[PDB]
Subunit: 297 residues, 4 copies
C-alpha cells in the first residue's frame, strides 16, 4: 500500500482505536545506554495492534453480512471487536481464545475449515497479515509514532518491530520510509524461527518445516505472507534474531522496570537491543506489539 | 500533620518524584458498573508511594551522616533512593554506632506528610478532569498512607469518604477503629498482600485515622487475586497484590460504595512470573 | 471564606468554566530578569475571572427567580452568563436596582463583597498552585490587580492555606491607591471621587467590608504603578505574547516593570481579563 | 518540493521553532456554523510562520558567511532570527518608508534603509550580496523556504489527527505562494480529497486570476489593502506551478470582511492576529455557505502594532 492508503486507514479507524502513548523510561535508557521510545500497542484496544488492521479492513467493506477470521489469537480478538463496531456477527476459526469468545465472537484444520465457512456463511474473510487494508491499518501505528516522536523533537535512528507474517513490519516500513528513508526499519525474530531473515537475504520466501518452538507465540508463523514479502524486500533494512534467553530477560525488564504487561512476542524489540545494542544507533523506537499474556500470581 | 505540612512535603520531593498519572479504563468501568480513577503509584519512583515518605523526611534532615531503615519491603527501596538523592549511605543499634538517621515506614510526621502528597495530586488531577470522587480507597498496613491521604482529602472536601482496606485475615486496623484503641495481631497474618502484614497501626497514625477516616473494609484472598487479575489483564499494569486491595474492595462491596471512586494503586513491586 | 469554601465553589463552577492555562514566555522572562507564570483569566468564559464569582454565588441559590447586580462592567457579563447557565433572567443595571429587587424579587449578586463570590474568584488560586506544582515551579509571589478586593481575597485565602511563606500582593494604579493606604491605616479609606486611570476595572471608591479584613490578615502588601508602566506592560503582553489583555489585567506585569528588583525571581501573575475594545 | 523534503525541513527546524497549537473556540464555532481549527502561527517564534522557511534554508547552508534578505515585514525578522541561531550576521534591506524595522534590528539584524525604495531594493540587495558574499534567503521562491513553511501543514494534520477531527478544507493567505505551496504539498500528499484554498484581498486577486488564466499575471502597482503581508505584485516562479496543480482554488474577501475577521479573533479568542493572518477567517464570513463544515484556518501571523 502507499502512504495515502495508510492515512485513509487512520481516518477510518481513529474513532475506534487509541492513540497509544510513546513511553520513555530513564531506568531502561540508563541500563542499556540507549534512548528508547516505546510505542505502547499493548495498551491498544483488545490488547494488541491487531485491532488496527482488523478495523481498517472491516470498515472499508460495503454492507458485509459478517466477519470471518483464521486465528492467531490476537487477530481473533481484533476481528471480534471490529464485528462489534460494525454490529455484525464474527466467526473465528482457531486451532486469547477466551477473550475472543468474550467480544461476542463464536470461536471454532484451519484453511479448509475457513474456506467451507466463507462459502457457507458468506462472511468477509479478514486475513491476519496478507491483506492490503490490514497492512495499511497496522501501518497507522507508524504514522502515530513519527508524529509523537516529532512532537517530542526526538528522531530515532531506527524502528524495531516483531515479525511473523510481516503485516506489522510492512505497514510500519511503508510509513517510516515514505517520510524519512534514512531511518532504519528492522524486524526482529526468535532465532529458533528465523525464516523471515533467511527469506530476505535469499530474496525468496523460505518456509519453516514445522512449528518453531519459541515463547513468542505470536510469531510462530511458518512463513512470511505473499503480499508482505515484496514490501519487506523493498523497504526493510534487515531482520535481527534473538535467543529465548534474551527474550525472557527483555520481558523481565519491561515487567519489573516499566510495570507494563507485555506478552513475550511484544518484547522481541527490547531483546534485540539487549543482544545487538552495540550495532544499533543511539535512539531507537520499539514497537511493543501486544500485552495479551496469561496472568500468574 | 496539617495540610500545610503535606504541601511543604510536596515542594521538597517534587523534583525527585513523578507526578503519577490518574488512569481511567472503560473496560473496568463497564465491568464493575462504576467510574474508577486509578492513582498509579506503581509508576512512582522505586515502584511504590514509599519514595514520597522517605524523601520527605530525608530532605528535611540537616547534615545527615547516613540513613537507616528497618526493612519491611518497599520502604527499603524508598530509603535507598533517598540516600542516593542526598548522596549519602543507606543501610537497611547501628544508630548510636554510625549516627545514621532512622526513617520509620509510617510512624513519623514527615513520612506521613510525604505519603499524603499523593492525595494532593489525586485531587488536582481529578479536578482538572472535572470528576469528583465520592470515595477514596487505599490499603492499610501501619497507616502512613491512609493517614496522609485522609489529611489531604478531609482538608479540602470533608464529604468525600476516605476508606481504608485490609485483607480479612489481617483486620486489626478495622477492629482498632471499632474499639477506639489499638489492637495488635499476635503473629504475622497469612495473606498475599505482603505489604500490609504489619502487626498493628502506628501510634502516630492511629489518632489521625479515628478522626479522619470513615471506615475500614475487609477483603477475602479470593477477591484480592481477582482484583490483581483484572488489573493485569485489563489495564496491562503490573500491580503487586497489596496495591490491588482497593479494587478488591469494589468487587466485594461495590453495591454499598459511591458510583465514582478513586483507588490508590500503592505499588507494583511484585516478582516477575514467566 | 475557608479553603473548603473555595473547593466547594470550585466543584460548583467546574463544569461551566475553563481551567485556564498557566502561560510562560521565554521572551518576557528574557526581557525581565524573572521567571513569569501568567494565569490566563483573559481566556476564561466571558473574558475575565468574574465568571467564577458569579457562578459560585448563582449556583448555590435555592430556586432563584432571576439575577441582578451592581454592574461594574465585566461583572455584568459574568452574572449574565450565570443566568444563562441557570436558565433564569438576568437584569443588569448599567450606568435604582433595589427597587427592581423588591419588584421582581431577583437575587442581587455583588461584584466582590460576598463570601460565595470571593470563594469563586479564589478558585483561580487553587488552579494556579495545582498547575505550577505540576510544572515543578514554585513562585515566591503572586500578584493580582485590586479593585473591590474579591479576587485578591480569594487568591490570598487559597495561597495562604497551602503555603503561607508565598508572598501575595495586590497592585493598583497610583492614581487610586486607597486599598494600599487602607492596609497602612488599618481602616477602610475611601476615594474622594473616581481616580481616572486606564485600568477601568479597578476604579472602585473603596475596598469591600468582607474583603478588607481578609486582606489585612492574608495580604503581604499592595504595590502602586504609574500609568506609563501600565501602558508598557500592556504593549509587552500584546506584542510579545500576542495576548489581548485589558489594561487592568496588565497591572501585575506593570508592577514587575517598576518593582522587579525587590520581588522574588519566580512570580505568578494573574491576567484578570481581556475585555478591551478592538482598535485596528 | 517533496513530502520527504518537508519532513527533512521539519527535522532541521524542530529544535528552534514552536509546535504551535491547533486552537478551537466554542464561540467562533457558534457565530459561524462551523467547526474551526485555528493553526496558531501567530504564536510561532518571531510572530509568524516565516521563521520556519528562513531556518529551513539557513540550516541547510554549508559554512554560511552571513544572511541577506530583502523584506518589507515578517521575513526580515525570520532571517534575523535564523542568523542568531547560526551565529552569523544578518543584513536586511527595506525601503526607507514603520516600526517593523525596529523588530528586525531587535533580533540583531543590520538594516540597509538609505535611499532604498521598491523596484530599487532588489538592485541594492544584489549589490550587497556581490559585496558581502552573504547568502540571500528569498521569502517564497526557494524550495527550502517553501519546504520549511510547509512544516506547518505537517503539524496541522498530526494535531488534527490526535483530536480525531478531519478538516474538509484548509485555508491560508496567499502572497508570494510559499506558505500555500508548502501547505498544499503536505496536505495533498496525505489526503487529496481535502480541499486546499488560498485567500487574498479582492483588491489584489492576481493569484486567483493567474490560476484561472494558466500563467502568472502581475499587478500594475502596489495594491491597496490592510493585509500588508500579501501586497506581493505576483506569485513566484517556483510556487506557481505547485499551486496550479496542488491548490483547489483561491477566494477573495472584502476589506470589510477582513476587518470583521480581525475583530472576531481579537474580541472572542483574545489573540493578537495581524490583518493578513485574519484572511482565512474572513473567507469563512463571506463564503461560509460554499465551504465544508470542518475547516482548518492558518493564522499566519500576529505581528501588528500595538494600539491603545
Ligand atoms: C500478530 C502479532 C505479531 C506479528 O505481526 P505479523 O503482522 O504477523 O508480523 C507480533 N506481535 C503480536 C503481539 C502480534 O499479535
Ligand atoms: C507500605 C505499603 C502499603 C501500606 O502503607 P502503610 O503506610 O504502612 O499503611 C500498602 N501498599 C504498598 C505497596 C506498600 O508498600
Ligand atoms: C473586577 C476586575 C478586577 C478587580 O477585582 P476586585 O475583585 O474588584 O478587586 C480586576 N481586573 C478585571 C479584568 C476585573 O474584571
Ligand atoms: C509572508 C506572509 C504571508 C504570505 O505568505 P506567502 O508565502 O508570501 O504567500 C501571509 N501572512 C503573513 C503573516 C506573512 O508574513
Ligand atoms: Ca519467523
Ligand atoms: Ca492490618
Ligand atoms: Ca483602588
Ligand atoms: Ca495577490
Amino acid at each position: 500500500p502507499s502512504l495515502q492508503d495508510l492515512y485513509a486507514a487512520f481516518r477510518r479507524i481513529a474513532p475506534y482505536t487509541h492513540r497509544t502513548p510513546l513511553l520513555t523510561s530513564r531506568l531502561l535508557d540508563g541500563l542499556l545506554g540507549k534512548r528508547l521510545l516505546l510505542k505502547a500497542e499493548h495498551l491498544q484496544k483488545t490488547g494488541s495492534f491487531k485491532a488496527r488492521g482488523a478495523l481498517s479492513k472491516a470498515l472499508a467493506l460495503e454492507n458485509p453480512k459478517g466477519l470471518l477470521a483464521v486465528s492467531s489469537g490476537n487477530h481473533a480478538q481484533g476481528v471480534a471487536y471490529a464485528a462489534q463496531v460494525l454490529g455484525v456477527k464474527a466467526l473465528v476459526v482457531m486451532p486469547k481464545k477466551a477473550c475472543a469468545r468474550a467480544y461476542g465472537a463464536e470461536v471454532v484444520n484451519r484453511e479448509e475449515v475457513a474456506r467451507a465457512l466463507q462459502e457457507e456463511t458468506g462472511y468477509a474473510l479478514i486475513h491476519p497479515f496478507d491483506d492490503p487494508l490490514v497492512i495499511a491499518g497496522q501501518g497507522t501505528a507508524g504514522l502515530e509514532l513519527l508524529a509523537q516522536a516529532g512532537r517530542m523533537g526526538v528522531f530515532p535512528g531506527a524502528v524495531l518491530a516483531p515479525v511473523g507474517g510481516g503485516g506489522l513490519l510492512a505497514g510500519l516500513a511503508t510509513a517510516v520510509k515514505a517520510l524519512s528513508p534514512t531511518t532504519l526499519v528492522l524486524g526482529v525474530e526468535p532465532e529458533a524461527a528465523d525464516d523471515a531473515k533467511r527469506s530476505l537475504e535469499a530474496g525468496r520466501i523460505l518456509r519453516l518445516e514445522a512449528p518453531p518452538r519459541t515463547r513468542a507465540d505470536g510469531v510462530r508463523t511458518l512463513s512470511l505472507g505473499e503480499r508482505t514479502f515484496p514490501i519487506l524486500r523493498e523497504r526493510v533494512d534487515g531482520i535481527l534474531t534473538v535467543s529465548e534467553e534474551a527474550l525472557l530477560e527483555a520481558e523481565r525488564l519491561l515487567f519489573t522496570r516499566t510495570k507494563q504487561v507485555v506478552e513475550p512476542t511484544g518484547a522481541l524489540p527490547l531483546a534485540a537491543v539487549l543482544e545487538h545494542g552495540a550495532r544499533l544507533p543511539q535512539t531507537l523506537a520499539l514497537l511493543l506489539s501486544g500485552g495479551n499474556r496469561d496472568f500468574s500470581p
